[PDB]
């Protein structure tokens, strides 16, 4: 005992759609614990390297901007009308990390074969301790719930391949990534290490000025140039890298002659940027199109 009243939880999460943005949904602690526990089971039963098929919609960082998450579903179609892949960074920086991750977990549980969540670098206790999620849990619930989230985040998948052609991850490529089997061998639960394959997948960035690999300004992981992308795509017979992790003005931005695209789905990020958010739709023929969300 007991079951999880998923439909009531989702109904309450969706209730505030159209209300003055910022209006909270305060689930019970056990409801949220239920969401973490049941989704954690689902994450572990599915591969850490997801293998997905189009059509699906792909979204980048949300960062607790819950009403922008709802807008994405509004324009993209609420599950299960459309399949979704999110590229991580659900929490921190925004005002409503809790509503955000809870709706995502809820949909993961309700539609486990049509709804998918990758791990971002903010789905990591050492990071979201600092940038808001801990403070939000502590304020609205307790630190024990925050540790329950950590335990759940530690089981998220870290990459996805869509129809053997699009490689998806939060950050980018790794100098340790030589085979896809190296990703599949990563055991869960796990924290995000300070270095290595898992770290790079959640932390690395493309860089125009770097030929091969370079030092990353974040002080973690690496930057990789257009050449690194071309070699990677050719080696694994892929057409595109789809990642997130960086705020871009129009919500999406191409790199290396459209061989890589960055998606960022949190419009006016932190209230400091004037960026749009974007969502990429991939149809059954792997035609990719962008919906852009201008900030409210």
């Amino acid at each position: 005992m007991g079951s999880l009243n998923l439909d009531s939880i989702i109904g309450r999460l969706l209730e505030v759609q159209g209300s003055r943005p910022g209006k909270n949904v305060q689930l019970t602690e056990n409801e949220i614990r239920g969401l973490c526990l049941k989704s954690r089971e689902i994450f572990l039963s599915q591969p850490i390297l997801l293998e997905l098929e189009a059509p699906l919609k792909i979204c980048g960082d949300i960062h607790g901007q819950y009403y922008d998450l709802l807008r994405l579903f509004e324009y993209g179609g609420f599950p299960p009308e459309s399949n979704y892949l999110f590229l991580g960074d659900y929490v921190d920086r925004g005002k409503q990390s809790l509503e955000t991750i809870c709706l995502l977990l809820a949909y993961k549980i309700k539609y486990p074969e049509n709804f998918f969540l990758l791990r971002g670098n903010h789905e990591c206790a050492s990071i979201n301790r600092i940038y808001g999620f801990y403070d939000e849990c502590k304020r609205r619930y307790n630190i024990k719930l925050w540790k329950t989230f950590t335990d759940c985040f530690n089981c998220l998948p870290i990459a996805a391949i869509v129809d053997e052609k699009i490689f998806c991850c939060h950050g980018g490529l790794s100098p340790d990534l030589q085979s896809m089997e190296q990703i599949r061998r990563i055991m869960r639960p796990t924290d995000v290490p300070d270095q290595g394959l898992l770290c790079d997948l959640l932390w690395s960035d493309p860089d125009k000025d770097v030929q091969g690999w370079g030092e990353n300004d974040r002080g973690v992981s690496f930057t990789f140039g257009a050449e690194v992308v071309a070699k990677f795509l050719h080696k694994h017979d892929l057409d595109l890298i789809c990642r997130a992790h960086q705020v871009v003005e129009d919500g999406y931005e191409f790199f290396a002659k459209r061989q890589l695209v960055t998606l960022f789905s949190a419009p006016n990020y932190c209230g400091e940027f004037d960026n749009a958010g974007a969502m990429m739709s991939v149809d059954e023929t792997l035609m990719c199109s962008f919906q852009i969300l201008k900030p409210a």
């Binding site: 807008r71 749009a276 792997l286 990719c288 962008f290």
Partner: peptide, 16 residues
């Protein structure tokens, strides 16, 4: 033999 292609039809969503 499917290949990734990009639509030039971009949809923008505003709030009036």
């Amino acid at each position: 033999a499917r290949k990734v292609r990009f639509s030039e039809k971009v949809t923008v969503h505003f709030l009036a």
